[PDB]
Amino acid sequence: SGRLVLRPWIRELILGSETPSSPRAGQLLEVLQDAEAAVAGPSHAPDTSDVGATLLVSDGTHSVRCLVTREALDTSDWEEAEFGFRGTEGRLLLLQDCGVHVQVAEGGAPAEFYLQVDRFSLLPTEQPRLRVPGCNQDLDVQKKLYDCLEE
């Protein structure tokens, strides 16, 4: 009887000149770097609890790299969910609190826009993952990138 649909928002957000007042839904395509929960007590096992998750998130039209901040990870309750993002690819993901940031060129990779997520929720919806260009491949985004760099 129809299907409910999410509006694309990534390109519009970056090109738009203010921070998002509203929460945005997007699909998790890939986990580039996953996160580990903070385990109290001294131990010889490595501690990576000071590092957030890094995801590739799609909106149906473009993808974007998202840095899920430690603050966002530690404030979420992981109810019936192993801590971290692997296994959840293809899931919908609600970015409730986030901002557009510029990453300058570094370690062989050119500059780009990316999102920093300070609050999020997984929705239960899972769905096929579709090939999608990066938002940084867009011409209007590229132009705005090089505007931002010059400052």
Swiss-Prot record:
| Short motif (PWI): ranges | 8-10
In which compartments does the protein localize?
Nucleus; Chromosome, Telomere
Which residues are reported to carry the modification Phosphoserine? S22
Please identify the protein, giving its name as recorded. Adrenocortical dysplasia protein homolog
Q: What is its biological role?
A: Component of the shelterin complex (telosome) that is involved in the regulation of telomere length and protection. Shelterin associates with arrays of double-stranded TTAGGG repeats added by telomerase and protects chromosome ends. Without its protective activity, telomeres are no longer hidden from the DNA damage surveillance and chromosome ends are inappropriately processed by DNA repair pathways. Promotes binding of POT1 to single-stranded telomeric DNA. Modulates the inhibitory effects of POT1 on telomere elongation.
Organism of origin? Homo sapiens
Q: In its UniProt record, what illness is this protein linked to?
A: Dyskeratosis congenita, autosomal dominant, 6: A form of dyskeratosis congenita, a rare multisystem disorder caused by defective telomere maintenance. It is characterized by progressive bone marrow failure, and the clinical triad of reticulated skin hyperpigmentation, nail dystrophy, and mucosal leukoplakia. Common but variable features include premature graying, aplastic anemia, low platelets, osteoporosis, pulmonary fibrosis, and liver fibrosis among others. Early mortality is often associated with bone marrow failure, infections, fatal pulmonary complications, or malignancy.
Q: How would you summarize the oligomeric state and partners of this protein?
A: Component of the shelterin complex (telosome) composed of TERF1, TERF2, TINF2, TERF2IP ACD and POT1. Forms heterodimers with POT1. Identified in a complex with POT1 and single-stranded telomeric DNA. Interacts with STN1 and TINF2.
Domain of life, per UniProt, equals Eukaryota
